[PDB]
Design a protein around this ligand. Structure first.
Ligand SMILES: *[C@@H]1O[C@H](CO)[C@@H](O[C@@H]2O[C@H](CO)[C@@H](O[C@@H]3O[C@H](CO)[C@@H](O)[C@H](O[C@H]4O[C@H](CO)[C@@H](O)[C@H](O)[C@@H]4O)[C@@H]3O)[C@H](O)[C@H]2NC(C)=O)[C@H](O)[C@H]1NC(C)=O
Ligand SMILES: *[C@@H]1O[C@H](CO[C@@H]2O[C@@H](C)[C@@H](O)[C@@H](O)[C@@H]2O)[C@@H](O[C@@H]2O[C@H](CO)[C@@H](O[C@@H]3O[C@H](CO)[C@@H](O)[C@H](O)[C@@H]3O)[C@H](O)[C@H]2NC(C)=O)[C@H](O)[C@H]1NC(C)=O
Ligand SMILES: *[C@@H]1O[C@H](CO[C@@H]2O[C@@H](C)[C@@H](O)[C@@H](O)[C@@H]2O)[C@@H](O[C@@H]2O[C@H](CO)[C@@H](O)[C@H](O)[C@H]2NC(C)=O)[C@H](O)[C@H]1NC(C)=O
Ligand SMILES: *[C@@H]1O[C@H](CO)[C@@H](O[C@@H]2O[C@H](CO)[C@@H](O)[C@H](O)[C@H]2NC(C)=O)[C@H](O)[C@H]1NC(C)=O
Ligand SMILES: *[C@@H]1O[C@H](CO)[C@@H](O)[C@H](O)[C@H]1NC(C)=O
Ligand SMILES: [Cl-]
Ligand SMILES: [Cl-]
Ligand SMILES: [Cl-]
Ligand SMILES: [Cl-]
Ligand SMILES: [Pt+2]
Ligand SMILES: [Pt+2]
Ligand SMILES: [Pt+2]
Ligand SMILES: [Pt+2]
Ligand SMILES: [Pt+2]
Ligand SMILES: [Pt+2]
Lengths: 499, 49, 501, 48
């Protein structure tokens, strides 16, 4: 009923993306009109005079917040009220503000986060910010969970001096910057004893409902600033209202007319497109070991097997949380999988081996293990392939790519900068959602012959199939679909390569 | 530079598509990706090409 | 974790069971060491000087409390704490104290319910208690639901002179009897505004958890005197902790190590074997209309119907049969081609004879043979009548299963009583999942004892009561023992096919 | 005194006992023959 502009987030830590300007356009593009950040918020390397006003819309950050190596004078995160800290930075921090300046000349001066009332998980660290003003006066015991205040290893300084004292109207001299506007709002340290969560004031009639986070404008549920757990229309619930309720005097399940489904941290009428609906009235991206999927008449719903097909986790989750690609070490686990719950990444590192990560080259022959993979729930990203392999034979049985998860939030299938001459994706019959990009494959010749639209199952799906091998050259060298393929092209020159 | 210093070039590169640099204050290596790449180790191509 | 002794309670209303002397015994027998009445607490027709001290142990009542026509002077429901009101008396009251006096305005005087602090559902109604003392001082606004205060029908006009003064230390001269110990202990109306339910004082630090019923001894969720809804071991909860909890971040379902199953009003670690287990982490009495029950490992679960499946039929006492006493003319209409009875089957004399109070035409005895298709009975089977032109329970010759998820009087799943049959004839009967079995008062019945009933019992404790039928020595004398071919374990008749093995 | 006599004795209200009218509460009640229970004495008291 009242959405809220949401956006992806980033994980570049302390890396710079090209020039300062380049790096900046990347930032501005990733958070322009964003109110909620599902990932992390990383503001780094911004220089003097670059406007960060677009940052004023950020209200929530799900992961961590990294502010570092910025020389810009002000970072206006004026409305960020919550940092969940689902995922940390450097193992311990939900908020890290580091080395914000250059040669003891200029640096980050003001960070007016006057609404940062809560950090659910993780600690906070400040270091080498010789120009940052006022933050020192902050009482973090009102923002960070007690079970994290001890891991706080901060350290401030005033080697800029152009710092004004907090306004006299502020609490115990606490503020995020000059002005009464930036005084620190307390909501957990000055609360009435008879209270659980945050509070409006110290009055017993001014306490917030337990499901409230940061603060509230009233004593009720629909009166929270930000929700603790789930969010239902305009309410904060510890769990979404079930679709069914047990009846203690019937030993039967009654249908709750006010039930809804769990979708992330929100409750909704019906699950969205391409998600699976469970018996528990929730939307999941992957069923359980015993279940599978059924649709065509309604919505894809899980069920339950015993001859269940083998489901292996994908790069990014499970035992491969910090694994960059399919590699010598992990390729064993994709043993004899038929379906991947998650995504598959194949980067050049897989073939070179990686020191910093103790991984030896992968034997090209090993990839044939993937021939059993018939479906991928997330996305398939191929940035490298064995040098002497003409096509992606190892995936010639891949039938469905669902796109439940996508690269950069957009792509479901990404085949770039390889030397393959044809795709070989003979079984690929459906790309549920997500975009398809097949670019920079200088010798790739059949891509455009396939009618991709015929594989899509969601509106707005598009392709970016350019800059591979020139059509004219493909025709000249006679690399085109076989004679028995008047239909929707082919995945290669071969007869059995035809769609 | 001032915040940075050279980076011991191992056999396998730290930054797949960009240059490594060791930043002094945090005492750890970071990257500066080549146009068209993203990631803590510049391992991903911005498919937003 | 269940910490209180239960009992069934009664549903006799204003009926008297024989002589005052007998009536008392039933009462005394049905409640003797009881702490929790699953049904209704009906104390009626108790006479002067009769000892009712055995009522001090009662602590809660799920249904209603009917106190009527008693001349005894004191009814020590001293520890009754809550009357849930799960079922009403006269469609409105959870508590009804009615006409408790003899002739010369002599009757009930002391009803010290010094702990009754909650009547979750239903109205209260006092009337014609010529001798009733103190009770009029009670403030029912702290006891009854704010939705029935106006549905109320209080009254205590008596002989003011025979009634002692409450006590100085009583809140607004409110007491159930004489002395301090009987002052109306308040836990709702005196609450510190910002609280949502019962409290334990006037202070803001002194109020009860949202789930506490009646009252509390702490502020937590494990300090309730009694629970409003579910009971999860030592805590009172709005719902039993689910076996699975959604993970907002990972968008998948996690296992909840605190998961429990919902059985009635409790949160258990496992569902009762006879019960069905749904996908919602709860024990149910039966599956949906387009499904059936499957056996696997030990737990019984539901399954979607592959095609036009086995047809299920609601029993008596459920659905459109909630107020039907027995299968009758009007009923039968709905029991043709049934393959399973979800619930119970009641066959009373009223069936064949016909009732005029409910305009129920007589029944055609021959019609009961439509039940011949029933192989399963989810609850219990109660038989108090049977066509005279039948020597065995013919119509039930195919019955193979009686689960007993529900039992007559909370004790029996099979009750065949006072019939003229010669043999049970339950040749297909193979299991009586739960509940006791009683076969008695059948003067011509001869083989019930040859069966090894314990073989059909799938629940510990089950027992049989097979007496007062046609004596053993009499059955032998006329040669009515099991056939020679039944060498095994008993029979259901005299013929060879009535053998078990 | 508290009791009267029951109305239209058609069929019968009580199944196993005699019907009596409660002058006071104004309504029919039953008195069951030994071995029965229920507002209408419809049930055999299985406990025995
Ligand atoms: C090839 O595949 C293997 C297995 O799939 C994969 O190995 C994994 O490596 C990662 C790290 O590269 C391991 O996880 C890390 O473990 C360290 C333990 O010291 C943690 O400290 C890490 O946590 C964070 O903090 C660290 C700072 O101290 C950071 O350096 C780190 O990046 C994290 O931010 C982190 O959890 C993981 O356990 C192994 N897996 C196994 C089972 O070996 C390997 O990386 C892959 N190689 C490539 C290049 O694809
Ligand atoms: C109502 O219930 C009481 C108590 O019953 C007893 O306690 C309950 C909590 C349950 O555990 C019952 O199983 C248990 O019987 C009955 O009063 C008790 O009666 C028994 C007779 O069986 C008395 O037993 C005594 O046992 C000693 C040996 O230990 C003998 O020497 C005595 O001669 C006698 O048999 C018991 O003392 C008595 N309880 C007391 C002390 O008050 C009561 O009979 C019952 N009413 C009925 C008949 O329904
Ligand atoms: C930064 O974002 C703005 C967003 O402007 C509009 O409002 C947003 C909430 C969202 O709905 C956008 O899609 C809207 O465009 C961009 O400004 C718009 O730019 C387009 C042309 O690109 C123009 O037609 C609109 O009029 C502009 N809207 C405004 C501000 O009135 C802006 O281009 C974005 N720049 C980036 C990507 O950094
Ligand atoms: C015979 O069966 C009929 C049908 O079930 C019973 O009729 C019901 O009687 C109750 C009395 O409390 C009413 O509330 C229902 O509305 C009646 N149902 C219908 C549809 O008529 C009848 O009571 C049974 N005879 C008995 C009890 O012996
Ligand atoms: C009951 O008496 C108390 C005095 O202790 C008083 O505060 C309260 O208002 C009275 N309740 C009524 C009937 O209003
Ligand atoms: Cl592993
Ligand atoms: Cl492994
Ligand atoms: Cl080929
Ligand atoms: Cl006890
Ligand atoms: Pt981006
Ligand atoms: Pt600190
Ligand atoms: Pt359900
Ligand atoms: Pt199916
Ligand atoms: Pt009883
Ligand atoms: Pt009243």
């Amino acid at each position: 009923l009242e959405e809220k502009k949401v956006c992806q987030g980033t994980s570049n830590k302390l890396t710079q993306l090209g020039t300062f300007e380049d790096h900046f356009l990347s930032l501005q593009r990733m958070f322009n009109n964003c109110e909620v950040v599902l990932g992390n918020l990383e503001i780094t390397y911004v220089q003097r005079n670059y406007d960060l006003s677009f940052l004023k819309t950020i209200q929530e950050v799900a992961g961590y917040v990294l502010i570092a190596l910025n020389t810009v004078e002000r970072i206006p995160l004026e409305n960020l009220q919550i940092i969940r800290g689902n995922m940390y930075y450097e193992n311990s921090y939900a908020l890290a503000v580091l080395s914000n300046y250059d040669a003891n000349k200029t640096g980050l001066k003001e960070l007016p986060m006057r609404n940062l009332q809560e950090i659910l998980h993780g600690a906070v660290r400040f270091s080498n910010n010789p120009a940052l003003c006022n933050v020192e006066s902050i009482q973090w015991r009102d923002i960070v969970s007690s079970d994290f205040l001890s891991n706080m290893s901060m350290d401030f300084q005033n080697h800029l001096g152009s710092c004004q004292k907090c306004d006299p109207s502020c609490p115990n001299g606490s503020c995020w910057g000059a002005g009464e506007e930036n005084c620190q709002k307390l909501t957990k340290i000055i609360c009435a004893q008879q209270c659980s969560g945050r509070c409006r004031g110290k009055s017993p009639s001014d306490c917030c409902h337990n499901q409230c986070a940061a603060g509230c404008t009233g004593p009720r549920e629909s009166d929270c600033l930000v929700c603790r757990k789930f969010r239902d229309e305009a309410t904060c619930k510890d769990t979404c209202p079930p679709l069914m309720l047990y009846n203690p005097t019937t030993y039967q399940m009654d249908v709750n007319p006010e039930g809804k489904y769990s979708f992330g941290a929100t409750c909704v009428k019906k699950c969205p497109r391409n998600y699976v609906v469970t018996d528990h009235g929730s939307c999941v991206r992957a069923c359980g070991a015993d279940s599978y999927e059924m649709e065509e008449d309604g919505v894809r719903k899980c069920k339950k097997c015993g001859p269940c097909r083998k489901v292996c986790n994908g790069i990014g989750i499970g035992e491969f949380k910090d694994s960059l690609s399919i590699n010598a070490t992990n390729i064993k686990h994709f043993k004899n999988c038929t379906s991947i719950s998650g995504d598959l990444h194949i980067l050049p590192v897989a073939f070179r081996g990686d020191s910093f990560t103790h991984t030896p080259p992968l034997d090209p022959q090993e990839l044939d293990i993937l021939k059993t993979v018939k479906e991928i729930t997330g996305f398939l990203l191929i940035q490298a392939w064995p040098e002497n392999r003409t096509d992606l034979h190892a995936f010639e049985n891949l039938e469905i790519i669902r796109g439940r998860t996508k690269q950069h939030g957009q792509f479901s299938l990404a085949v770039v900068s390889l030397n393959i001459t044809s795709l070989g994706l003979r079984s690929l019959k459906e790309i549920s959602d997500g975009d398809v990009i097949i670019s920079g494959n200088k010798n790739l010749c059949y891509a455009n012959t396939i009618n991709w639209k015929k594989l899509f199952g969601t509106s707005g799906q598009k392709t970016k199939i350019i800059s591979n091998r020139g059509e004219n050259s493909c025709k000249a060298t006679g690399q085109v679909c076989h004679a028995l393929c008047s239909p929707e092209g082919c995945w290669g020159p071969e007869p059995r390569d035809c769609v | 530079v001032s915040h940075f210093n050279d980076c011991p070039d191992s056999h396998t590169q730290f930054c797949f598509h960009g240059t490594c640099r060791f930043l002094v204050q945090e005492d750890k290596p970071a990257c500066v990706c080549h146009s068209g790449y993203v990631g803590a180790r510049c391992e991903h191509a911005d498919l937003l090409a």
